[PDB]
Amino acid sequence: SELSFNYPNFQSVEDITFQGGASPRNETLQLTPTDSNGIPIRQRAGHAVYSQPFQLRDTSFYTTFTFVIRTTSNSPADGFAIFIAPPDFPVKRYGGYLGLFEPNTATNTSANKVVAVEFDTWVNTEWKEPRYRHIGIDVNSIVSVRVTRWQDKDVFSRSIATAHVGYDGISKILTAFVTYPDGGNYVLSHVVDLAEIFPGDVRIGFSGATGQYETQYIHSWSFSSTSTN
Amino acid sequence: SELSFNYPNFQSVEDITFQGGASPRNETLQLTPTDSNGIPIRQRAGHAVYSQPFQLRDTSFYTTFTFVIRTTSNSPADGFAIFIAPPDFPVKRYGGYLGLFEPNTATNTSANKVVAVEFDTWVNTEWKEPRYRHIGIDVNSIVSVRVTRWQDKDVFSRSIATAHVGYDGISKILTAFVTYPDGGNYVLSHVVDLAEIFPGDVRIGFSGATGQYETQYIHSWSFSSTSTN
Numbered sequence: 064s065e066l067s068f069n070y071p072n073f074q075s076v077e078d079i080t081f082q083g084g085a086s087p088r089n090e091t092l093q094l095t096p097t098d099s100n101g102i103p104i105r106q107r108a109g110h111a112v113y114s115q116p117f118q119l120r121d122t123s124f125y126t127t128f129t130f131v132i133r134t135t136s137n138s139p140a141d142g143f144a145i146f147i148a149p150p151d152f153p154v155k156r157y158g159g160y161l162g163l164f165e166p167n168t169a170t171n172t173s174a175n176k177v178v179a180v181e182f183d184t185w186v187n188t189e190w191k192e193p194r195y196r197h198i199g200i201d202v203n204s205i206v207s208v209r210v211t212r213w214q215d216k217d218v219f220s221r222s223i224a225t226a227h228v229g230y231d232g233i234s235k236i237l238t239a240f241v242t243y244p245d246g247g248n249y250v251l252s253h254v255v256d257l258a259e260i261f262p263g264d265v266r267i268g269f270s271g272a273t274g275q276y277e278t279q280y281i282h283s284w285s286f287s288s289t290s291t292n
Numbered sequence: 293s294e295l296s297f298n299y300p301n302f303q304s305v306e307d308i309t310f311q312g313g314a315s316p317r318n319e320t321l322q323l324t325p326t327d328s329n330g331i332p333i334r335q336r337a338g339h340a341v342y343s344q345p346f347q348l349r350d351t352s353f354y355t356t357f358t359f360v361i362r363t364t365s366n367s368p369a370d371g372f373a374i375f376i377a378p379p380d381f382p383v384k385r386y387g388g389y390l391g392l393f394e395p396n397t398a399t400n401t402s403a404n405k406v407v408a409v410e411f412d413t414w415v416n417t418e419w420k421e422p423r424y425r426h427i428g429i430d431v432n433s434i435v436s437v438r439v440t441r442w443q444d445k446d447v448f449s450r451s452i453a454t455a456h457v458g459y460d461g462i463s464k465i466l467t468a469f470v471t472y473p474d475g476g477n478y479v480l481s482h483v484v485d486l487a488e489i490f491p492g493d494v495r496i497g498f499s500g501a502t503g504q505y506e507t508q509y510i511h512s513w514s515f516s517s518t519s520t521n
């Protein structure tokens with residue numbers, strides 16, 4: 064279906080729903096909470112989602128957002144993701160589950176219905192992940208189907224980074240491009256038929272989780288979807 | 293292999309090779325020529341190519357550029373493309389061939405070694421094309437493998453538009469995202485193993501062709517490639 068929205072900043076959150084530990088703060092989407100002294104709270108997850116459902120049958124989309132990862136140590140955890148799931152998909156487990164999964168089924172593709180592009184700041188040994196911080200595409204599992212190294216210089220840059228995420232509904236390909244000013248560029252694509260995974264309605268949004276010593280902020284977001292008829 | 297470059301404008305055109313009717317003009321890459329009164333010269337092609345070659349085995353890349361199409365009538369022709377080609381790739385036929393193909397082999401994928409993302413302003417009947425202006429991915433043929441409608445409002449906007457083109461060398465997927473300020477967004481992706489097409493050196497660049505009543509300009513361009521090892 065056709066949907067378009069544009070948030071150059073979040074002084075308005077008119078159509079944004081906050082769940083769990085996420086909240087609007089300082090003109091951004093703050094995905095995990097901080098205490099009254101600004102210290103990141105451990106073991107929390109949050110979602111900030113566009114409130115209106117849409118359909119993926121015969122649809123392509125383009126979305127872009129800007130983000131900042133704020134770290135208070137060299138050992139931040141756990142990251143965030145942009146995700147698509149049914150409209151009643153709730154905030155799930157904190158820590159390395161990224162608010163998207165729970166421990167008993169995190170790696171079980173038959174037990175989840177969620178697709179995401181993750182920005183993963185903490186190497187988990189509890190399941191298979193690369194031995195470095197990484198950006199990945201997740202399809203129904205915390206173990207990414209496509210993963211690439213995310214350079215530490217970029218992770219810790221303090222920069223407003225840009226993501227571009229697109230889905231070509233003809234070729235059935237999901238792509239992310241991630242760029243840092245005067246920094247790295249990242250490209251990841253994967254063939255996945257989203258309409259087959261999601262035959263009904265979906266919502267798109269963000270999920271963040273701690274972890275420790277980290278807060279994730281969304282500064283701007285726009286989206287457009289169009290029919291492939 | 294690993295290569296990076298950045299032209300925030302083309303005040304300097306150091307490391308750009310011009311062929312055909314392309315030239316530096318007014319701090320941009322002008323892909324097709326104009327006479328001294330500014331009138332587009334019909335039936336001309338031009339290339340502006342980054343001079344340093346790279347290899348595609350075990351490689352991903354990201355490139356972005358801004359562009360303007362100056363039309364001087366309601367029936368401009370023919371467009372332009374960003375393309376990759378092997379060494380010594382010459383300027384080929386003007387008109388609907390876009391500087392990238394010759395007539396008798398333009399539709400034969402066994403007779404070309406060229407991959408492009410084209411911005412096609414003139415509907416040709418000499419080969420199969422959609423019946424509207426379009427953006428396409430071309431693999432070894434002027435008949436695009438993936439094509440989408442390019443809205444006239446964007447074609448004729450005189451806006452500085454943006455293209456992002458990425459290649460994921462693990463999944464073997466080429467993707468283009470094209471955006472217009474306050475206009476359309478476009479997404480196309482295609483599975484293609486570029487290292488199997490191009491086993492040695494390649495260069496990346498732009499090819500434009502007339503046609504009539506059109507000039508194509510590149511305003512800015514950056515590129516990075518990284519090993520997937």
Ligand SMILES: CC(=O)N[C@H]1[C@H](O[C@H]2[C@@H](O)[C@@H](CO)O[C@H](O[C@@H]3[C@H](O)[C@@H](O)[C@H](O[C@H]4[C@H](O)[C@@H](O)[C@H](O)O[C@@H]4CO)O[C@@H]3CO)[C@@H]2O)O[C@H](CO)[C@H](O)[C@@H]1O
Pocket residue numbers: 369370386387388389414416417418502503504
């Ligand atoms: C292939 C190509 O690059 N086409 C470009 C086109 O080029 C034509 C133009 O140079 C004319 C000058 O008017 O000469 C040639 O075309 C001839 C006739 O002028 C043209 O009318 C004719 O058109 C036929 C068409 O090709 C068929 O597909 C159709 O079924 O029937 C038509 C009528 O006969 O073709 C002859 C040559 O065979 C050049 O081919 O120029 C335009 C802009 O005007 C644009 O650049 C095209 O990409």
Ligand SMILES: [Ca+2]
Pocket residue numbers: 181183192197199205207
């Ligand atoms: Ca991960």
Ligand SMILES: [Ca+2]
Pocket residue numbers: 141159183184185186187192
């Ligand atoms: Ca992790």
Ligand SMILES: [Ca+2]
Pocket residue numbers: 410412421426428434436
């Ligand atoms: Ca075409």
Ligand SMILES: [Ca+2]
Pocket residue numbers: 370388412413414415416421
């Ligand atoms: Ca054409």
Ligand SMILES: [Cl-]
Pocket residue numbers: 325333
């Ligand atoms: Cl000339």
